[PDB]
Amino acid sequence: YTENLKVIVAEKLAGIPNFNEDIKYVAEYIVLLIVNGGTVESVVDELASLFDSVSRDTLANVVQTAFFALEALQQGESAENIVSKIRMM
């Protein structure tokens, strides 16, 4: 599920107004933090230390969506369906 998660995180990032950072890199960094056992708080904390152009509230939304999407994937939800939901929003 790591390759689809990186895509799903990128899709979420792409929808953030005024998001100026390298999306592919931020998505990779997020998935690195999550796959290796981070808590929601520890992942948000780490991202906030790297990117001062993005609010903690926004980072928290992105992180929440990532963990949520991962669980959904594990339960057998399709990555397409998850992407379609993120893009609607």
Residue numbers in the entry: 6 to 94
Mind quoting what the paper says about this structure?
The Nab2 protein has a modular structure based on four functional domains:23 a unique N-terminal domain of approximately 100 residues, a glutamine-rich linker, an RGG domain, and a Zn-finger domain. Our studies demonstrate that the N-terminal domain of Nab2 is both necessary and sufficient to mediate interaction with Mlp1.
We also obtained P43212 symmetry crystals of the Nab2 N-terminal domain that diffracted past 1.8 Å resolution in-house. We used the solution NMR structure of this domain as a model for molecular replacement and, after trying a number of different models containing different fragments of the structure, were able to obtain a unique solution using residues 7–82 (corresponding to helices H1–H4). After solvent flattening, the electron density enabled residues 6–94 to be built to produce a structural model that had an R-factor of 20.7% (Rfree = 26.4%) and excellent geometry after iterative cycles of refinement and rebuilding. The crystal and solution structures of the N-terminal domain of Nab2 were very similar for helices H1–H4 and superimposed with a Cα rmsd of 1.2 Å. However, the position of helix H5 varied significantly between the two structures as a result of a rigid-body rotation of the order of 25°. This difference in the position of helix H5 could have been the result of crystal packing or might have been a consequence of partial proteolysis as it was only possible to trace the chain in the crystal structure as far as residue 94, whereas in the solution structure, this helix extended to residue 99. Overall, the mutagenesis results are consistent with Phe73 forming a crucial component of the interaction interface between Nab2 and Mlp1 and hydrophobic interactions making an important contribution to the interface.
